[PDB]
Amino acid sequence: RGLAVGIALVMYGRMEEADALIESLCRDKDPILRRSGMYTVAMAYCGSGNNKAIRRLLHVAVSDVNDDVRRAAVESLGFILFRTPEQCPSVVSLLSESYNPHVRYGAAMALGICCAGTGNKEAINLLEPMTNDPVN
Amino acid sequence: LEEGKAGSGLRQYYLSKIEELQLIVNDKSQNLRRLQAQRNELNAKVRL
Amino acid sequence: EFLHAQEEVKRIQSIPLVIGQFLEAVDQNTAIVGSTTGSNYYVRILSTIDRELLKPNASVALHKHSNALV
Amino acid sequence: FQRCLDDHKYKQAIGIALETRRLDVFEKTILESNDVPGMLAYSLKLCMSLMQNKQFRNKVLRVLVKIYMNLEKPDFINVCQCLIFLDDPQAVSDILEKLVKEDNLLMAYQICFDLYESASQQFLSSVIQNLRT
Protein backbone atom coordinates (compact mmCIF):
# COMPACT_ATOMS: atom_id res chain seq x y z
CA ARG A 1 0.00 0.00 0.00
CA GLY A 2 2.95 2.32 0.53
CA LEU A 3 4.30 1.45 -2.91
CA ALA A 4 0.74 1.69 -4.25
CA VAL A 5 0.65 5.47 -4.04
CA GLY A 6 4.39 5.71 -4.71
CA ILE A 7 4.41 4.22 -8.20
CA ALA A 8 1.30 6.26 -8.97
CA LEU A 9 3.10 9.40 -7.89
CA VAL A 10 6.41 8.77 -9.68
CA MET A 11 4.59 9.76 -12.88
CA TYR A 12 2.61 12.99 -12.86
CA GLY A 13 1.03 14.74 -15.82
CA ARG A 14 2.74 12.74 -18.55
CA MET A 15 -0.55 12.50 -20.49
CA GLU A 16 0.54 9.76 -22.90
CA GLU A 17 3.86 8.56 -21.53
CA ALA A 18 2.50 6.23 -18.84
CA ASP A 19 0.24 3.97 -20.89
CA ALA A 20 2.60 0.99 -20.98
CA LEU A 21 2.71 1.12 -17.19
CA ILE A 22 -1.00 2.02 -17.01
CA GLU A 23 -1.95 -1.10 -18.92
CA SER A 24 0.52 -3.36 -17.11
CA LEU A 25 -0.67 -2.52 -13.60
CA CYS A 26 -4.32 -3.07 -14.48
CA ARG A 27 -3.77 -6.53 -15.92
CA ASP A 28 -2.05 -8.10 -12.89
CA LYS A 29 -3.84 -10.37 -10.42
CA ASP A 30 -2.71 -8.37 -7.39
CA PRO A 31 -5.75 -6.31 -6.28
CA ILE A 32 -3.61 -3.64 -4.63
CA LEU A 33 -1.54 -3.29 -7.79
CA ARG A 34 -4.68 -2.93 -9.91
CA ARG A 35 -5.81 -0.34 -7.39
CA SER A 36 -2.49 1.46 -7.70
CA GLY A 37 -2.86 1.57 -11.47
CA MET A 38 -6.10 3.45 -10.96
CA TYR A 39 -4.30 6.11 -8.95
CA THR A 40 -1.64 6.24 -11.65
CA VAL A 41 -4.08 6.98 -14.48
CA ALA A 42 -5.48 9.71 -12.25
CA MET A 43 -2.17 11.43 -11.63
CA ALA A 44 -0.95 11.22 -15.22
CA TYR A 45 -4.13 12.75 -16.65
CA CYS A 46 -4.86 15.54 -14.16
CA GLY A 47 -7.14 18.24 -15.51
CA SER A 48 -7.57 16.72 -18.97
CA GLY A 49 -10.87 15.83 -20.59
CA ASN A 50 -9.54 12.61 -22.10
CA ASN A 51 -12.30 10.34 -23.30
CA LYS A 52 -9.77 7.50 -23.26
CA ALA A 53 -9.22 8.15 -19.55
CA ILE A 54 -12.86 8.34 -18.46
CA ARG A 55 -13.77 5.29 -20.57
CA ARG A 56 -11.04 3.01 -19.24
CA LEU A 57 -11.21 4.39 -15.71
CA LEU A 58 -14.91 3.70 -15.31
CA HIS A 59 -15.14 0.40 -17.21
CA VAL A 60 -13.20 -1.18 -14.35
CA ALA A 61 -15.36 0.74 -11.85
CA VAL A 62 -18.38 -1.33 -12.85
CA SER A 63 -16.74 -4.61 -13.77
CA ASP A 64 -14.04 -5.38 -11.23
CA VAL A 65 -14.51 -7.90 -8.45
CA ASN A 66 -12.58 -6.43 -5.53
CA ASP A 67 -14.36 -3.51 -3.89
CA ASP A 68 -11.28 -1.48 -2.91
CA VAL A 69 -10.28 -1.09 -6.55
CA ARG A 70 -13.88 -0.06 -7.30
CA ARG A 71 -13.44 2.84 -4.88
CA ALA A 72 -10.14 4.09 -6.25
CA ALA A 73 -11.66 3.92 -9.70
CA VAL A 74 -14.55 6.19 -8.73
CA GLU A 75 -12.26 8.27 -6.53
CA SER A 76 -10.09 9.05 -9.56
CA LEU A 77 -13.05 10.80 -11.23
CA GLY A 78 -12.40 14.17 -9.62
CA PHE A 79 -8.67 14.18 -10.33
CA ILE A 80 -9.23 14.24 -14.08
CA LEU A 81 -12.29 16.51 -14.18
CA PHE A 82 -11.63 19.17 -11.54
CA ARG A 83 -10.96 21.92 -14.08
CA THR A 84 -14.53 21.72 -15.46
CA PRO A 85 -16.81 21.16 -12.45
CA GLU A 86 -20.02 21.12 -14.50
CA GLN A 87 -19.61 17.46 -15.48
CA CYS A 88 -18.94 15.86 -12.09
CA PRO A 89 -22.52 16.20 -10.73
CA SER A 90 -23.85 14.69 -13.95
CA VAL A 91 -21.60 11.62 -13.92
CA VAL A 92 -21.40 10.63 -10.24
CA SER A 93 -25.07 11.16 -9.28
CA LEU A 94 -26.19 7.81 -10.61
CA LEU A 95 -23.12 6.05 -9.21
CA SER A 96 -24.01 7.52 -5.82
CA GLU A 97 -27.07 5.24 -5.75
CA SER A 98 -25.38 1.90 -6.40
CA TYR A 99 -26.04 -1.36 -4.59
CA ASN A 100 -22.73 -1.68 -2.76
CA PRO A 101 -21.46 0.98 -0.33
CA HIS A 102 -17.92 1.02 -1.72
CA VAL A 103 -19.09 2.60 -4.96
CA ARG A 104 -21.27 4.94 -2.92
CA TYR A 105 -18.29 5.87 -0.76
CA GLY A 106 -15.96 6.89 -3.56
CA ALA A 107 -18.90 8.58 -5.24
CA ALA A 108 -19.07 10.96 -2.28
CA MET A 109 -15.39 11.88 -2.18
CA ALA A 110 -15.40 12.32 -5.95
CA LEU A 111 -17.72 15.26 -5.30
CA GLY A 112 -15.34 16.51 -2.63
CA ILE A 113 -12.34 16.72 -4.93
CA CYS A 114 -13.84 17.69 -8.30
CA CYS A 115 -15.84 20.65 -7.07
CA ALA A 116 -13.11 21.75 -4.69
CA GLY A 117 -14.13 24.95 -2.94
CA THR A 118 -17.00 26.27 -5.00
CA GLY A 119 -20.56 27.06 -4.08
CA ASN A 120 -21.76 24.41 -6.51
CA LYS A 121 -24.94 23.46 -4.53
CA GLU A 122 -25.72 20.67 -7.00
CA ALA A 123 -23.13 18.48 -5.31
CA ILE A 124 -24.67 19.60 -2.02
CA ASN A 125 -28.04 18.57 -3.46
CA LEU A 126 -26.57 15.10 -3.98
CA LEU A 127 -24.88 14.83 -0.57
CA GLU A 128 -28.12 15.34 1.37
CA PRO A 129 -29.27 11.67 1.32
CA MET A 130 -25.62 10.59 1.29
CA THR A 131 -25.13 11.80 4.86
CA ASN A 132 -28.37 10.01 5.80
CA ASP A 133 -27.21 6.60 4.67
CA PRO A 134 -27.70 3.42 6.71
CA VAL A 135 -24.08 2.33 6.27
CA ASN A 136 -21.73 4.12 8.64
CA LEU B 1 -22.81 44.08 -48.25
CA GLU B 2 -19.92 44.29 -45.80
CA GLU B 3 -21.49 41.62 -43.57
CA GLY B 4 -24.00 40.24 -46.08
CA LYS B 5 -21.21 38.59 -48.05
CA ALA B 6 -19.60 37.57 -44.76
CA GLY B 7 -22.83 36.14 -43.35
CA SER B 8 -23.36 33.66 -46.19
CA GLY B 9 -19.72 32.71 -46.78
CA LEU B 10 -17.87 32.33 -43.48
CA ARG B 11 -20.71 32.42 -40.95
CA GLN B 12 -23.09 30.19 -42.91
CA TYR B 13 -20.28 27.65 -42.83
CA TYR B 14 -20.51 27.83 -39.04
CA LEU B 15 -24.31 28.16 -38.79
CA SER B 16 -24.81 25.05 -40.90
CA LYS B 17 -22.12 23.29 -38.88
CA ILE B 18 -23.51 23.98 -35.40
CA GLU B 19 -27.04 23.01 -36.48
CA GLU B 20 -26.68 19.22 -36.55
CA LEU B 21 -24.20 19.39 -33.67
CA GLN B 22 -27.12 20.83 -31.73
CA LEU B 23 -29.46 18.14 -33.09
CA ILE B 24 -27.32 15.23 -31.88
CA VAL B 25 -26.97 16.72 -28.39
CA ASN B 26 -30.73 17.30 -28.47
CA ASP B 27 -31.05 13.61 -29.40
CA LYS B 28 -28.62 12.01 -26.95
CA SER B 29 -30.09 13.69 -23.86
CA GLN B 30 -33.40 12.07 -24.74
CA ASN B 31 -31.57 8.77 -25.17
CA LEU B 32 -29.51 9.24 -22.00
CA ARG B 33 -32.43 9.79 -19.62
CA ARG B 34 -34.04 6.65 -21.01
CA LEU B 35 -30.89 4.76 -20.02
CA GLN B 36 -30.85 6.47 -16.62
CA ALA B 37 -34.30 5.32 -15.49
CA GLN B 38 -33.80 1.82 -16.87
CA ARG B 39 -30.77 1.58 -14.61
CA ASN B 40 -32.88 3.12 -11.84
CA GLU B 41 -35.44 0.33 -12.04
CA LEU B 42 -32.99 -2.57 -11.93
CA ASN B 43 -30.96 -1.02 -9.13
CA ALA B 44 -34.17 -0.52 -7.16
CA LYS B 45 -34.76 -4.25 -7.60
CA VAL B 46 -31.39 -5.43 -6.37
CA ARG B 47 -31.12 -3.14 -3.33
CA LEU B 48 -34.56 -4.36 -2.26
CA GLU C 1 -26.34 -9.80 -9.28
CA PHE C 2 -30.09 -9.71 -9.88
CA LEU C 3 -29.90 -13.36 -10.89
CA HIS C 4 -27.76 -14.13 -7.84
CA ALA C 5 -30.46 -12.55 -5.70
CA GLN C 6 -33.34 -14.56 -7.15
CA GLU C 7 -31.37 -17.78 -6.79
CA GLU C 8 -30.55 -17.21 -3.12
CA VAL C 9 -34.17 -16.26 -2.44
CA LYS C 10 -35.22 -19.44 -4.25
CA ARG C 11 -32.90 -21.79 -2.36
CA ILE C 12 -33.91 -20.65 1.11
CA GLN C 13 -37.07 -22.75 0.92
CA SER C 14 -35.95 -26.12 -0.46
CA ILE C 15 -34.86 -27.41 2.95
CA PRO C 16 -36.28 -29.54 5.81
CA LEU C 17 -38.83 -26.95 6.86
CA VAL C 18 -40.64 -27.15 10.17
CA ILE C 19 -44.40 -26.66 10.21
CA GLY C 20 -46.24 -24.26 12.45
CA GLN C 21 -49.58 -22.54 12.08
CA PHE C 22 -50.19 -18.91 11.17
CA LEU C 23 -51.63 -16.92 14.04
CA GLU C 24 -51.80 -13.15 13.42
CA ALA C 25 -50.46 -10.56 11.00
CA VAL C 26 -49.09 -7.30 12.38
CA ASP C 27 -48.51 -5.36 9.19
CA GLN C 28 -46.82 -5.63 5.83
CA ASN C 29 -44.10 -8.34 5.74
CA THR C 30 -44.06 -9.23 9.46
CA ALA C 31 -46.43 -11.46 11.44
CA ILE C 32 -46.99 -13.76 14.42
CA VAL C 33 -46.75 -17.50 13.88
CA GLY C 34 -46.88 -20.28 16.44
CA SER C 35 -44.88 -23.43 15.83
CA THR C 36 -45.85 -27.02 16.42
CA THR C 37 -42.93 -27.18 18.82
CA GLY C 38 -44.99 -24.98 21.08
CA SER C 39 -43.27 -21.70 21.98
CA ASN C 40 -45.10 -19.09 19.88
CA TYR C 41 -42.84 -16.77 17.87
CA TYR C 42 -42.67 -13.46 16.02
CA VAL C 43 -40.75 -13.40 12.75
CA ARG C 44 -40.54 -11.67 9.40
CA ILE C 45 -42.44 -13.07 6.43
CA LEU C 46 -41.50 -13.10 2.77
CA SER C 47 -42.46 -11.06 -0.27
CA THR C 48 -43.29 -14.13 -2.36
CA ILE C 49 -46.51 -15.32 -0.72
CA ASP C 50 -49.71 -13.61 -1.77
CA ARG C 51 -51.08 -12.42 1.56
CA GLU C 52 -54.67 -13.59 0.93
CA LEU C 53 -53.86 -17.13 2.13
CA LEU C 54 -53.26 -16.20 5.78
CA LYS C 55 -56.81 -15.58 6.85
CA PRO C 56 -56.53 -16.18 10.55
CA ASN C 57 -55.29 -19.69 10.07
CA ALA C 58 -53.11 -21.79 7.80
CA SER C 59 -50.47 -24.41 8.36
CA VAL C 60 -47.26 -22.69 7.32
CA ALA C 61 -43.67 -23.59 6.57
CA LEU C 62 -40.86 -22.19 8.68
CA HIS C 63 -37.08 -22.13 8.49
CA LYS C 64 -35.23 -23.79 11.35
CA HIS C 65 -32.81 -21.09 12.44
CA SER C 66 -34.05 -17.82 10.96
CA ASN C 67 -37.57 -19.08 11.73
CA ALA C 68 -39.22 -16.77 9.16
CA LEU C 69 -42.26 -17.57 7.07
CA VAL C 70 -41.18 -19.56 4.08
CA PHE D 1 -9.44 33.28 -45.89
CA GLN D 2 -9.18 36.37 -48.12
CA ARG D 3 -12.94 36.68 -47.64
CA CYS D 4 -12.23 36.45 -43.91
CA LEU D 5 -9.77 39.28 -44.49
CA ASP D 6 -12.54 41.09 -46.36
CA ASP D 7 -14.86 40.33 -43.43
CA HIS D 8 -12.95 42.86 -41.22
CA LYS D 9 -13.98 40.42 -38.45
CA TYR D 10 -11.06 38.10 -37.81
CA LYS D 11 -12.32 35.71 -35.16
CA GLN D 12 -14.05 34.00 -38.07
CA ALA D 13 -10.58 33.94 -39.65
CA ILE D 14 -8.91 32.47 -36.58
CA GLY D 15 -11.32 29.52 -36.44
CA ILE D 16 -10.26 27.83 -39.68
CA ALA D 17 -6.63 28.85 -39.02
CA LEU D 18 -6.50 26.61 -35.97
CA GLU D 19 -8.55 23.87 -37.64
CA THR D 20 -6.15 23.12 -40.50
CA ARG D 21 -3.00 23.39 -38.30
CA ARG D 22 -1.50 26.27 -40.32
CA LEU D 23 0.38 28.90 -38.35
CA ASP D 24 1.54 31.69 -40.66
CA VAL D 25 -2.15 32.40 -41.20
CA PHE D 26 -2.26 32.50 -37.38
CA GLU D 27 0.56 35.05 -37.23
CA LYS D 28 -0.89 37.34 -39.89
CA THR D 29 -4.32 37.70 -38.24
CA ILE D 30 -2.69 39.13 -35.11
CA LEU D 31 -0.02 41.07 -37.02
CA GLU D 32 -2.75 42.54 -39.20
CA SER D 33 -3.83 46.18 -39.32
CA ASN D 34 -4.97 47.91 -36.14
CA ASP D 35 -8.10 45.89 -35.36
CA VAL D 36 -8.01 45.09 -31.61
CA PRO D 37 -4.45 43.83 -30.91
CA GLY D 38 -5.85 41.95 -27.88
CA MET D 39 -6.88 39.10 -30.17
CA LEU D 40 -3.91 37.36 -28.55
CA ALA D 41 -5.85 37.56 -25.27
CA TYR D 42 -8.68 35.71 -26.98
CA SER D 43 -6.27 33.23 -28.55
CA LEU D 44 -4.48 32.54 -25.27
CA LYS D 45 -7.70 31.56 -23.48
CA LEU D 46 -8.70 29.63 -26.60
CA CYS D 47 -5.47 27.61 -26.33
CA MET D 48 -5.75 27.48 -22.55
CA SER D 49 -9.29 26.16 -22.23
CA LEU D 50 -10.04 23.81 -25.09
CA MET D 51 -6.75 22.50 -26.49
CA GLN D 52 -6.61 18.72 -26.06
CA ASN D 53 -3.32 17.88 -27.79
CA LYS D 54 0.01 19.04 -26.40
CA GLN D 55 2.09 18.33 -29.51
CA PHE D 56 1.27 21.49 -31.44
CA ARG D 57 -0.08 23.31 -28.39
CA ASN D 58 3.35 24.56 -27.36
CA LYS D 59 4.01 25.45 -31.01
CA VAL D 60 0.96 27.70 -31.10
CA LEU D 61 1.96 28.87 -27.63
CA ARG D 62 5.48 29.76 -28.80
CA VAL D 63 4.36 31.43 -32.00
CA LEU D 64 2.41 33.64 -29.60
CA VAL D 65 5.56 34.65 -27.71
CA LYS D 66 7.15 35.70 -30.99
CA ILE D 67 4.62 38.51 -31.21
CA TYR D 68 4.85 39.18 -27.46
CA MET D 69 8.57 39.83 -27.87
CA ASN D 70 7.72 41.88 -30.97
CA LEU D 71 5.12 43.75 -28.93
CA GLU D 72 6.13 47.03 -27.30
CA LYS D 73 6.36 45.91 -23.67
CA PRO D 74 7.58 42.34 -23.09
CA ASP D 75 7.24 41.59 -19.40
CA PHE D 76 3.75 41.34 -18.13
CA ILE D 77 1.71 38.21 -18.88
CA ASN D 78 3.53 36.30 -21.63
CA VAL D 79 6.13 34.68 -19.40
CA CYS D 80 3.99 33.11 -16.71
CA GLN D 81 1.13 32.21 -19.04
CA CYS D 82 3.18 30.60 -21.83
CA LEU D 83 6.79 29.85 -20.93
CA ILE D 84 6.01 27.86 -17.78
CA PHE D 85 4.01 25.51 -19.99
CA LEU D 86 6.87 25.67 -22.50
CA ASP D 87 9.32 25.08 -19.54
CA ASP D 88 12.25 27.11 -20.88
CA PRO D 89 14.45 27.96 -17.87
CA GLN D 90 17.15 30.08 -19.45
CA ALA D 91 14.71 31.98 -21.67
CA VAL D 92 13.18 33.38 -18.48
CA SER D 93 16.55 34.12 -16.86
CA ASP D 94 17.92 36.00 -19.85
CA ILE D 95 14.93 38.23 -20.53
CA LEU D 96 14.59 39.07 -16.84
CA GLU D 97 18.29 39.95 -16.81
CA LYS D 98 17.33 42.21 -19.72
CA LEU D 99 14.62 43.80 -17.58
CA VAL D 100 17.13 44.54 -14.83
CA LYS D 101 19.56 45.89 -17.42
CA GLU D 102 17.42 48.89 -18.45
CA ASP D 103 17.07 49.68 -14.69
CA ASN D 104 13.50 48.42 -14.42
CA LEU D 105 13.27 46.70 -11.03
CA LEU D 106 9.57 47.42 -10.49
CA MET D 107 7.94 44.98 -12.91
CA ALA D 108 10.65 42.33 -12.72
CA TYR D 109 9.85 42.47 -9.00
CA GLN D 110 6.27 41.64 -9.97
CA ILE D 111 6.96 38.77 -12.37
CA CYS D 112 9.18 36.89 -9.91
CA PHE D 113 6.32 36.76 -7.41
CA ASP D 114 3.94 35.56 -10.11
CA LEU D 115 6.50 32.97 -11.23
CA TYR D 116 6.97 31.54 -7.73
CA GLU D 117 3.24 31.27 -7.08
CA SER D 118 2.42 29.57 -10.37
CA ALA D 119 5.32 27.52 -11.68
CA SER D 120 6.70 24.34 -10.20
CA GLN D 121 9.77 22.91 -8.51
CA GLN D 122 12.88 22.23 -10.68
CA PHE D 123 11.79 24.87 -13.16
CA LEU D 124 12.56 27.51 -10.57
CA SER D 125 15.64 25.56 -9.47
CA SER D 126 16.79 25.43 -13.09
CA VAL D 127 16.28 29.14 -13.77
CA ILE D 128 17.99 30.26 -10.54
CA GLN D 129 21.05 28.29 -11.64
CA ASN D 130 21.08 30.37 -14.82
CA LEU D 131 20.48 33.49 -12.73
CA ARG D 132 23.93 33.49 -11.13
CA THR D 133 25.73 32.69 -14.41
Swiss-Prot record, chain B:
Subcellular location(s) of the protein: Cytoplasm; Nucleus
Family membership: Belongs to the AAA ATPase family.
Role, per record: Component of the 26S proteasome, a multiprotein complex involved in the ATP-dependent degradation of ubiquitinated proteins. This complex plays a key role in the maintenance of protein homeostasis by removing misfolded or damaged proteins, which could impair cellular functions, and by removing proteins whose functions are no longer required. Therefore, the proteasome participates in numerous cellular processes, including cell cycle progression, apoptosis, or DNA damage repair.
Quaternary context: Component of the 19S proteasome regulatory particle complex. The 26S proteasome consists of a 20S core particle (CP) and two 19S regulatory subunits (RP). The regulatory particle is made of a lid composed of 9 subunits, a base containing 6 ATPases including PSMC5 and few additional components. Component of a complex with USP49 and RUVBL1. Interacts with PRPF19. Interacts with TRIM5. Interacts with NDC80. Interacts with PAAF1. Interacts, in vitro, with the thyroid hormone receptor (in a thyroid hormone T3-dependent manner) and with retinoid X receptor (RXR). Interacts with ERCC6.
Protein name: 26S proteasome regulatory subunit 8
The encoding gene: PSMC5
Positions spanned in the full protein: 11 to 58 of 406
Swiss-Prot record, chain C:
Subcellular location: Cytoplasm; Nucleus
Superkingdom of source: Eukaryota
Stated family: Belongs to the AAA ATPase family.
Subunit-level organization: Component of the 19S proteasome regulatory particle complex. The 26S proteasome consists of a 20S core particle (CP) and two 19S regulatory subunits (RP). The regulatory particle is made of a lid composed of 9 subunits, a base containing 6 ATPases including PSMC4 and few additional components. Interacts with NR1I3. Interacts with PAAF1. Interacts with TRIM5. Interacts with ZFAND1.
Function: Component of the 26S proteasome, a multiprotein complex involved in the ATP-dependent degradation of ubiquitinated proteins. This complex plays a key role in the maintenance of protein homeostasis by removing misfolded or damaged proteins, which could impair cellular functions, and by removing proteins whose functions are no longer required. Therefore, the proteasome participates in numerous cellular processes, including cell cycle progression, apoptosis, or DNA damage repair.
Protein name: 26S proteasome regulatory subunit 6B
The organism of origin for this protein: Homo sapiens
Curated annotation (Swiss-Prot), chain D:
Similarity comment: Belongs to the proteasome subunit S1 family.
Role of this protein: Component of the 26S proteasome, a multiprotein complex involved in the ATP-dependent degradation of ubiquitinated proteins. This complex plays a key role in the maintenance of protein homeostasis by removing misfolded or damaged proteins, which could impair cellular functions, and by removing proteins whose functions are no longer required. Therefore, the proteasome participates in numerous cellular processes, including cell cycle progression, apoptosis, or DNA damage repair.
Subunit and partners: Component of the 19S proteasome regulatory particle complex. The 26S proteasome consists of a 20S core particle (CP) and two 19S regulatory subunits (RP). The regulatory particle is made of a lid composed of 9 subunits, a base containing 6 ATPases and few additional components including PSMD1. Interacts with ADRM1. Interacts with ZFAND1.
Protein name, UniProt field: 26S proteasome non-ATPase regulatory subunit 1
This protein's encoding gene: PSMD1
